[PDB]
Amino acid sequence: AREDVVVTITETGYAKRTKTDLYRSQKGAGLKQDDIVAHFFVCSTHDLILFFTTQGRVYRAKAYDLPEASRTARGQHVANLLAFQPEERIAQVIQIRGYTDAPYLVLATRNGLVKKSKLTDFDSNRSGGIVAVNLRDNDELVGAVLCSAGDDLLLVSANGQSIRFSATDEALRPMGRATSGVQGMRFNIDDRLLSLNVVREGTYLLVATSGGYAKRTAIEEYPVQGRGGKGVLTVMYDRRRGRLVGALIVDDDSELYAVTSGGGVIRTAARQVRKAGRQTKGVRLMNLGEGDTLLAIARNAE
Numbered sequence: 001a002r003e004d005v006v007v008t009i010t011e012t013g014y015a016k017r018t019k020t021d022l023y024r025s026q027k028g029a030g031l032k033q034d035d036i037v038a039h040f041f042v043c044s045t046h047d048l049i050l051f052f053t054t055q056g057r058v059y060r061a062k063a064y065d066l067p068e069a070s071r072t073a074r075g076q077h078v079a080n081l082l083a084f085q086p087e088e089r090i091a092q093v094i095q096i097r098g099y100t101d102a103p104y105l106v107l108a109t110r111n112g113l114v115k116k117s118k119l120t121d122f123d124s125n126r127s128g129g130i131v132a133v134n135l136r137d138n139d140e141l142v143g144a145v146l147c148s149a150g151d152d153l154l155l156v157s158a159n160g161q162s163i164r165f166s167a168t169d170e171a172l173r174p175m176g177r178a179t180s181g182v183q184g185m186r187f188n189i190d191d192r193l194l195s196l197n198v199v200r201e202g203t204y205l206l207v208a209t210s211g212g213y214a215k216r217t218a219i220e221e222y223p224v225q226g227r228g229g230k231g232v233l234t235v236m237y238d239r240r241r242g243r244l245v246g247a248l249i250v251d252d253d254s255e256l257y258a259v260t261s262g263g264g265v266i267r268t269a270a271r272q273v274r275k276a277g278r279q280t281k282g283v284r285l286m287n288l289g290e291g292d293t294l295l296a297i298a299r300n301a302e
Helices: none
Strands: 004-010 014-019 037-044 048-053 057-062 090-096 104-109 113-118 129-131 141-147 152-157 161-166 193-198 204-209 213-218 244-250 255-260 265-269 294-300
Touching (some): 004 090, 048 141, 090 141, 104 193, 141 193, 152 204, 193 244, 204 294
Parallel strands (some): 244 294
Antiparallel strands (some): 004 014, 057 129, 104 113, 104 141, 152 161, 204 213, 255 265, 255 294
16 A cells, blocks of 8 residues: 555664554653654655664665554564664664665764765665675764765764764765775774764754763854864863763754663753853753763654
């Protein structure tokens, strides 16, 4: 059947689809990570869902390949449904209509590498997973975005460095799938890449530390620089406050979850998080318990 569906993927990696009309009619333990809707796509049963993995592969599924379930169900674990390799996990999910939807796919790795490929290079029904990037043994894929050569990309590290660069074809050449990435950001041994995002106007980069200190900064405050540098600070670090646990792009109406160490999952909105300068320390989340710490922040996708 060809139907309009809502595809939901939880933060924990469980997926399902629900007919749009049914989803709209549907609904003592507290919130848990399975309740976090990480991805929410209103699409067709016949559209494609691309699952980029930590091992640098991409698995495709038509939305009809995701099981039908009520809004309340978490669904089926994607790694199990799509026969991922042992220990392979979801890194990012992108819904597309077809392979001409954007000119490029840009990927980013834990170790700060980036790679652009033509989106049509992924138009293959070959086995389950296809290689999207060649990774070294101690690297992992962390981000994947659709973009054009007219876009800027933002990379953010756990130690609070950020780099924004223009993803022109001169600066970031389109490359093959089964090749290594090029340097996106340079950082210390003790650092790692948290996120990759396409810059969009009117948004904010919301950062939060393990100590629970959060802030959001207008995207304009991130300077455009050459790919591969150390970038600039996006937080004022202090040992008492901790490293970054999350770096998300939000709008004034974005809804979020704070995953605490000792109090489960708490709801927060971007509007609850203080707007401040790029090199500011952040403000402790009010709802975070005293002595509790933050494990992660997650977007509430709907």
